[PDB]
């Protein structure tokens, strides 16, 4: 109310409204899902168009050969943050000949988002990210919130109506975590997960976006006729 003019102000109950308003931009975003087994990690994203004459806004971005993310909210902010991750992954490779641990990637995003919540003039990032990767400790899934909070999960979803997929994955937990050495089945589970968040619209060929990374699979994105297999 009187305490939402900037990020540098606390409300009387200890809230940061600018950070909460940034969180709200994610809620308006199109639904995206993340889930993993012990061998692979999978992103599924519902893409959004302006109208029938426009393209469908790309939701998934590659960060390295072993890492990448999906976005929900302000897309330019995802571009800034993904670019930062690309550099951090890159620095680790050039300087230490070391693939950046998905966990460190989370810590680095947390600290970059945090600085924008304590200084005058700045604003919080207005985007949520789901980071998947395969590193020296196996497959991983992370959830980034622009409050700075990063969380490691077996599965999750962010965006509008994400609660449907998040409930489904919570039920399916014991099944999909043991889909080891089978990419097409882990994707099927993720495609069924994102279907619990659809209303009046169904998954089409220029609507669905799937990404996968794992033991013997570089981070690769599927669009167009390559996702027809899964509808």
């Amino acid at each position: 109310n009187n305490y939402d003019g900037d990020t540098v102000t606390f409300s009387p109950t200890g809230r940061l409204f600018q950070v909460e308003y940034a969180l709200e931009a994610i809620k308006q975003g199109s639904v995206t899902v993340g889930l993993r087994s012990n061998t692979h990690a999978v992103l599924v994203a519902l893409k959004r168009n302006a109208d029938e004459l426009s393209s469908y806004q790309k939701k998934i971005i590659k960060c390295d050969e072993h890492m990448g993310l999906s976005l929900a909210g302000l897309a330019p902010d995802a571009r800034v943050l993904s670019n930062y991750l690309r550099q951090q992954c890159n620095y680790s490779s050039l300087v230490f000949n070391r693939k950046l641990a998905v966990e460190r990637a989370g810590h680095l995003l947390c600290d970059k988002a945090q600085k924008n919540t304590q200084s005058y003039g700045g604003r919080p990032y207005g985007v949520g990210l789901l980071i998947i990767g395969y590193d020296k400790s196996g497959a991983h899934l992370l959830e980034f919130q622009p409050s700075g909070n990063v969380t490691e999960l077996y599965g999750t979803a962010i965006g509008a109506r994400s609660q449907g997929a998040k409930t489904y994955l919570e039920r399916t937990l014991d099944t999909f975590i043991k889909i080891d050495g089978n990419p097409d089945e882990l994707i099927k589970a993720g495609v069924e997960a994102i279907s619990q968040s659809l209303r009046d619209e169904s998954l089409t060929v220029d609507n669905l976006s799937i990404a996968i990374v794992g033991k013997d699979t570089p981070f690769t994105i599927y669009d167009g006729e390559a996702v027809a297999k899964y509808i």
Partner: protein, 235 residues
């Protein structure tokens, strides 16, 4: 007052949303993409009859393979065009090749959110970027001050946009010829414009693989206007 980079309670940036209102006050610009080329057309809208209309420059070349149309606070577009041209030429210097249309558009959109307390405010102008490259063929992009860009088969921006866009939804198909697209831009511009459309208050342009980006003469557009009026009377 309040910070320039402040979020609204609905999760949107005040200044970005307000600049979108400035663009709705701008003159209409329409683009249509075909397999034979991309057409760009704009309403000139002279504020007075004494103003020499050919000095109104709302369609602009970025490179031989990329052109651009604008709507809103058009003075804001000068540095955007300057950046676009430098980005295009610089990429050719570094890589001995043409820069992809999408890469150009992404570069222009990188300027957009570089405001705050960097420039003092967002741009008050939207851009239609049209071009050709070997990988993805003929392309049309709508670049906004939000930093977001969508690829379009056809798109209208400015005061007559929502009416013109609804018209473009009905008319566009994946088999339109370049000539069919030219006439369609003229037809839809004539519909949404205030004053009566002629060769002096509207301008056409296209980009083709073979001949690159070309702004049409007033003589060439006048004949397309005459061809359009004759075809509408012919049924």
């Amino acid at each position: 007052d309040r910070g320039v980079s402040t979020f609204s309670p609905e999760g949107r940036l005040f200044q970005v949303e307000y600049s979108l209102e400035a663009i709705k006050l701008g003159s209409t610009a329409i683009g249509i993409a075909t397999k034979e080329g991309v057409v760009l057309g704009v309403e000139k809208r002279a504020t007075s009859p004494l103003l020499e209309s050919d000095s109104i420059e709302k369609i602009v070349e970025i490179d031989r393979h990329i052109g651009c149309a604008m709507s809103g606070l058009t003075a804001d577009a000068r540095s955007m065009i300057e950046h676009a041209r430098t980005a295009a030429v610089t990429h050719n210097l570094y890589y001995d090749e043409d820069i992809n249309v999408e890469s150009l558009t992404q570069s222009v959109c990188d300027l957009a959110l570089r405001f705050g307390e960097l420039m003092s405010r967002p741009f008050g102008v939207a851009l239609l970027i049209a071009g050709h490259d070997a990988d993805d063929g003929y392309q049309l992009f709508h670049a906004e001050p939000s930093g977001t860009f969508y690829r379009y088969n056809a798109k209208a921006i400015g005061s007559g946009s929502e009416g013109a866009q609804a018209e473009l939804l009905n008319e566009w198909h994946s088999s339109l010829t370049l000539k069919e697209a030219e006439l369609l831009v003229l037809k839809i511009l004539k519909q949404v414009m205030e004053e009566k459309l002629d060769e002096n208050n509207a301008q056409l342009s296209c980009i083709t693989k073979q001949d690159g980006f070309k702004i049409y003469d007033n003589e060439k557009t006048a004949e397309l206007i005459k061809e359009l009026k004759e075809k509408e009377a012919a049924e």
